[PDB]
Amino acid sequence: GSSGSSGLLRNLLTGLVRHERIEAPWARVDEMRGYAEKLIDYGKLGDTNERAMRMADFWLTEKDLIPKLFQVLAPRYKDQTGGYTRMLQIPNRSLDRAKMAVIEYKGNCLPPLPLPSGPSSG
Template identity: 45%
Template sequence: MNQADVSKLVSQLKFRVNPRLRKFRNSGGPEERLNWLRKTVTALIKHERIELNYPRADEARMYAERLISDAIRYGDCHKTTMDVADYWIVEKQLIHKLFKVLVPRYEHYNVAYTRLIKVPRVYPGDTLPKAVLELKGNPYPSLLPDTSTNRGIIHNVLLDEAKKAYRQQKYAEIAAKIDAAEEKFSDLKISGKDEKNVSSL
């Protein structure tokens, strides 16, 4: 069985991929669908954060992730990867950005490179669900509330105090252990001295 391990042929994406592709009704057929998505992927790489309809964002995310992971895996000297990048990126100057900016940024990531967030739709307006698709590590302010670095938020205060109490308890245990050991040692010393005294006698 000299078959290659199939799972290693294609780079594994770090989020749930749709088992079936969306068709996106349009007059141009499958090719037009891809042209649409090329525009979206290009816009994502250019602006790093875009707001659009949810289905299209979800679909474009898969292609963008695959493109970045291939770029990381094969580098810019690999012809196939270059062709793929040339196909997916409509504005050609962004190919440089892909290899010189995004590849170094995501080289050591072991999570997804993009983030997809559902956002409320504008009222009154169309009823389609909206989403924001962004590249991680972009320079914009975060969309999600920061609950981990702000240590003043109530759950962080409670956790920090719990940690302190736990440490104190552990230190007390260690101190008690040391005390016990020292006592034992001094007892031994005393008894040893007694023995010496006995032998000298």
């Protein structure tokens, strides 16, 4: 279907790390997930590789988020053995049916939420 974009994806990565959690559709989650995931992998290497630095600076503008990500998630995952981010499914609160999802980094300090009991949401 739809694939390819600019500017928007960059804002998603910056916002996701800032609040270590953001709300976006499947198309955005999958597309952003691939870019965000790769970014984390490079960060684990440290602020020594030009590729990782350029990627963080190119993808993330926040001059503070660039260094923090390498001194926050980079080290946090450095040990981890995979699975950095997590995708969650959520209902749509719009007139017309829509596909929304919630993404969060495996390592946040946010409160949980009550899962839907009914086998059908919409």
